Amino acid sequence: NLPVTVAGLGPMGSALAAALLDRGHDVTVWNRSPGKAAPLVAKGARQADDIVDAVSASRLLVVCLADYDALYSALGPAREALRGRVVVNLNSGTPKEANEALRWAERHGTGYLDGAIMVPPAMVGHPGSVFLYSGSAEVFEEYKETLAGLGDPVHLGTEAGLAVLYNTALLSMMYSSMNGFLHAAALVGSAGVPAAEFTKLAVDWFLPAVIGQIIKAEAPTIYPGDAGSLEMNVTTLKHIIGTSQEQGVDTEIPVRNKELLDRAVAAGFGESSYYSVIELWR
Amino acid sequence: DQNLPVTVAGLGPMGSALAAALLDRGHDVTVWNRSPGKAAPLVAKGARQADDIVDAVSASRLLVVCLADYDALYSALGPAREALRGRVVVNLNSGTPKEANEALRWAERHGTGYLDGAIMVPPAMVGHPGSVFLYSGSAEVFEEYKETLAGLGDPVHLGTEAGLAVLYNTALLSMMYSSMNGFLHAAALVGSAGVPAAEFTKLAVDWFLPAVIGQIIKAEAPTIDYPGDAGSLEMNVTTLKHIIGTSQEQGVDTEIPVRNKELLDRAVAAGSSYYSVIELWR
Ligand SMILES: C[C@H]1NCCc2ccccc21
């Protein structure tokens, strides 16, 4: 039961469709290029002829396409068939793109959720999958159970752009953290330290016990316990850069991190908090 | 000997915490500091103050040193050359691994056992649950004093070579600085929409950091085996273009994601997995 249509059958859209099939939904699939539907049809999906049939088959339409232009092109022809259905858009962009899609959906009498997929395709549907959602709370509550088949659905608020905002923010932190980890791994690696054991120490202990706790301790709105003054952290970074040079590891990462603190010291004091670094960017 | 005499040389905020922790665990603690005015609070708690460094060293077989740098260690302890014979130095503030190896050499020249250690928590956490200290140096010396060292924090022995503790410490902290900075960009980005920092912080630290950042790191780490991974360099460039785009829309400085994207563009040109970025630095 709970018929669902998936539009877009790239690697992510295919995973969405397959996860929905595995929970036993009546899944209708649609894609622009041919040949992406066959593997899903084999697994029990009905392929729709035209986008109107696809949209008409289900009250819930899960969209996973390249951008907003792609969404309009794909779903534009559906016209009055969208009226009274719900679009769950899993591929915005930026928050302005999310708001543009909300506008498009509302013009067509269509409910709208914007979602960010927080795991790779292969994790979709499996324990650990988490999807962030923004949009009408009524709509979210009505389709929550269906959405749960893809991953733990977290509703951030009713404004269209929030999911993309949170997703882009979290991912920005992820890239920096991963790059720092790779500097770390290069550093120990240059002494011949085996990576597996260091990785486990860094991820299973240091990341939650030290990095997480220090972040919360620096957050002025939230361990006894903080990162210490800017000036003491500058000195720490000078030792990291020194160590990196000794070991023959590129100093780019700690050099940039030190320059950032130097800027924050100059704007405030050597005694200002670590968190005040954020004032350089807003 | 559960009340083993210990001397602490250096009574800055960390050294003072070490001394207080040792006093709480039933040691006869002798304290020393170059500048006056730091010993009195510890004397009140039961520490014996030493006049000069020779008296300090002569009072205990175990000497815990917590000074600014290596130069400070040599200048402080130099006069006590001879008194050091047959004692053990646990140096808790080497700046680089070459410095750790220099101090080993100095200690051994004088007939003195040597451990190097890195304190992984702030002063206020020292001697409380969650305190962790990393050690490197002679396994025999570590085994002999392990139980005393356990009073300060969980003692993790990395190996016998003098520089390992500094190497691991500098690596882990390098990752920390990058992670915190990426978090601050994240917080600025959601903050620019009026999202409250407390709730975002909790989501980022209590869920995203272990469930996503930690797992993606392990997935990329070729020696550890989350059926997915970070995806190709090229897909991550595109993701970063969206983060930069979102950051511009929101009026938040793009410095952090711009640098992260430039790194990947360098890695694409060198010519593939996210983890291969590491090859730019060694
Ligand atoms: C350098 C100091 N300040 C930042 C927090 C921290 C955490 C672990 C070990 C040292 C430090």
Side-chain angles (χ1 to χ4, degrees), chain A residues 2-35 37-45 47-58 60-67 70-78 80-82 84-90 92-95 97-141 143 146-196 198-199 201-230 232-282, chain B residues 1-44 46-47 49-60 62-81 83-97 99-139 141-198 200-201 203-225 227-282:
Chain A
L2 302 71
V4 184
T5 299
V6 176
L9 296 181
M12 192 58 87
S14 291
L16 301 168
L20 292 166
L21 283 169
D22 192 63
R23 283 227 320 167
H25 297 274
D26 285 350
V27 182
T28 300
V29 302
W30 180 95
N31 194 59
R32 187 64 82 197
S33 279
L40 295 149
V41 177
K43 301 187 203 196
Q47 169 163 27
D49 10 81
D50 96 286
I51 194 71
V52 169
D53 180 22
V55 166
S56 296
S58 313
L60 187 69
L61 324 164
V62 177
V63 181
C64 191
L65 300 169
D67 57 20
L71 176 144
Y72 182 96
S73 154
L75 281 47
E80 292 90 344
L82 291 156
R85 295 180 195 271
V86 172
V87 164
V88 172
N89 186 1
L90 291 174
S92 311
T94 66
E97 279 174 35
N99 298 157
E100 260 200 286
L102 170 68
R103 269 154 63 218
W104 173 90
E106 292 190 342
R107 276 195 306 278
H108 298 74
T110 304
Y112 184 79
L113 294 177
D114 203 272
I117 297 162
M118 305 312 296
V119 298
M123 280 229 63
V124 163
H126 293 313
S129 188
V130 175
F131 285 48
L132 308 182
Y133 289 96
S134 56
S136 158
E138 303 73 64
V139 169
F140 177 81
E141 284 307 314
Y143 293 94
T146 302
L147 296 175
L150 300 166
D152 188 21
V154 178
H155 189 254
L156 303 170
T158 57
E159 292 52 73
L162 288 166
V164 172
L165 186 72
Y166 275 73
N167 183 44
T168 57
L170 291 168
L171 295 172
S172 192
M173 175 192 180
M174 180 186 80
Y175 294 110
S176 284
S177 308
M178 289 179 85
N179 300 160
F181 172 76
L182 297 173
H183 187 252
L187 263 176
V188 298
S190 72
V193 176
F198 176 76
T199 299
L201 178 73
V203 172
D204 297 341
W205 167 71
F206 188 74
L207 176 166
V210 179
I211 298 176
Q213 295 265 74
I214 283 164
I215 286 166
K216 286 179 167 163
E218 295 302 320
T221 53
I222 290 284
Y223 208 75
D226 76 11
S229 63
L230 290 177
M232 170 262 260
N233 293 108
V234 168
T235 297
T236 303
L237 276 154
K238 290 183 186 164
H239 292 143
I240 293 168
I241 294 166
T243 294
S244 192
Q245 288 180 355
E246 293 179 10
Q247 294 301 132
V249 174
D250 196 307
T251 60
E252 177 62 32
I253 289 297
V255 166
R256 297 278 91 77
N257 290 150
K258 181 188 170 284
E259 289 183 347
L260 205 52
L261 302 192
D262 291 334
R263 290 166 49 206
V265 168
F269 318 68
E271 300 298 314
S272 298
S273 69
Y274 196 103
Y275 201 88
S276 72
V277 164
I278 200 177
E279 303 311 337
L280 283 7
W281 298 324
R282 61 180 180 189
Chain B
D1 185 359
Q2 310 295 304
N3 314 106
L4 180 79
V6 188
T7 295
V8 177
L11 297 180
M14 193 61 84
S16 290
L18 298 168
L22 290 167
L23 283 168
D24 292 344
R25 285 172 191 73
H27 299 92
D28 170 42
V29 182
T30 297
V31 302
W32 179 92
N33 191 246
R34 185 202 83 58
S35 293
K38 289 164 187 172
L42 294 148
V43 176
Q49 190 173 8
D51 288 334
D52 71 36
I53 198 69
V54 172
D55 290 10
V57 168
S58 297
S60 308
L62 186 69
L63 322 164
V64 177
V65 181
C66 193
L67 300 170
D69 57 19
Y70 266 53
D71 295 335
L73 175 144
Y74 302 122
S75 84
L77 299 210
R81 269 178 322 293
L84 291 154
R85 186 172 299 279
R87 296 179 197 273
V88 171
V89 166
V90 173
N91 186 2
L92 269 359
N93 204 26
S94 313
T96 68
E99 279 172 30
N101 296 341
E102 268 168 13
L104 172 68
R105 228 117 61 202
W106 175 90
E108 290 189 345
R109 206 154 47 245
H110 300 315
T112 133
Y114 186 81
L115 291 181
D116 203 93
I119 299 160
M120 306 311 298
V121 297
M125 281 229 64
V126 164
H128 291 112
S131 192
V132 176
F133 285 45
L134 308 182
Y135 291 95
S136 55
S138 157
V141 169
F142 177 80
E143 284 308 314
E144 175 162 20
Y145 294 96
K146 194 194 356 192
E147 232 194 295
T148 303
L149 295 173
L152 280 8
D154 187 18
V156 178
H157 182 70
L158 303 170
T160 56
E161 295 51 67
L164 291 165
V166 173
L167 186 70
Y168 275 70
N169 185 42
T170 54
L172 292 168
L173 296 174
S174 191
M175 177 190 178
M176 182 185 79
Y177 293 113
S178 285
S179 311
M180 290 191 297
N181 298 159
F183 172 75
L184 294 176
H185 182 251
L189 188 59
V190 297
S192 71
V195 178
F200 177 73
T201 299
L203 176 74
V205 172
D206 298 342
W207 167 73
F208 186 75
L209 184 52
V212 178
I213 296 176
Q215 294 266 78
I216 280 55
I217 285 166
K218 287 178 171 164
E220 286 287 328
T223 53
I224 294 284
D225 192 352
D229 70 14
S232 62
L233 291 179
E234 296 77 10
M235 169 261 113
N236 290 106
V237 169
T238 300
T239 303
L240 277 155
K241 290 182 186 166
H242 291 144
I243 292 166
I244 293 168
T246 295
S247 191
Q248 290 167 337
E249 293 184 4
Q250 295 300 134
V252 171
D253 192 315
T254 58
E255 179 170 21
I256 288 295
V258 165
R259 292 223 168 93
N260 290 329
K261 182 189 170 284
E262 290 172 329
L263 202 53
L264 300 194
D265 291 337
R266 289 186 291 277
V268 306
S272 298
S273 70
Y274 194 103
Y275 199 86
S276 74
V277 163
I278 199 178
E279 301 310 337
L280 297 167
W281 297 325
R282 61 180 179 192

